[PDB]
């Protein structure tokens, strides 16, 4: 999974 992807 991408850490910089949408976390909201």
């Amino acid at each position, epitope marked *: 999974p991408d850490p*910089n*992807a*949408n*976390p909201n």
Partner: antibody
Amino acid sequence: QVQLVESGGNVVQPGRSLRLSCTASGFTFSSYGMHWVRQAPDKGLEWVAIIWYDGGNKFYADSVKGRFTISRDNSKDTLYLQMNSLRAEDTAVYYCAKAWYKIDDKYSMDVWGQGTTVTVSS
Amino acid sequence: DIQMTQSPSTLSASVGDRVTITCRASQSISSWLAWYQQKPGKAPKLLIYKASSLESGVPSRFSGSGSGTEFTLTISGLQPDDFATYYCQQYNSYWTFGQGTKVEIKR
């Protein structure tokens, strides 16, 4: 507006544990990911950890992986950082930051708290 | 890890001057670069995102340019409130910061 208040910073002996809190107000805390960032002269600005809005996806920096645990309680609008096996190099000012509401392929943080100070020494 | 380095470390300037801070990345981060401003004893504050996009509430004297590995922050007409330390940050792969650039009063 958006307000982040850190607490829990204290003087701790090496190898012990400390728990930091970030109490949020002014925004819907349950909808945003949150970051922990630390600052010290030997470290500059150093990202520590991020947690997704629901508390599932968590990523850590190598410098703290295996020792620090990030968690949150959305019913209290409070973010936590559990620090275990603390080292002298962990001494820094610890900030909590909100992930921004800018829609794009990559995301970062916008609003920071005032910070709480952690000093690790014997 | 993508390394961020800023130039210069200390910039000496006067009110009204047009000054430029440079940020460089160890590898390409596309345009995923943010600039923050921090005053002593205070928290960082977001100024520019996506290299060139001004944050709402930030005066228009702050402008940004750059892509890939080289980026710049330019303050046109320095004001007394602008004397502080400015950090760049890449958010392409995790989050790493520059060492910081302190803008001081020239005398």
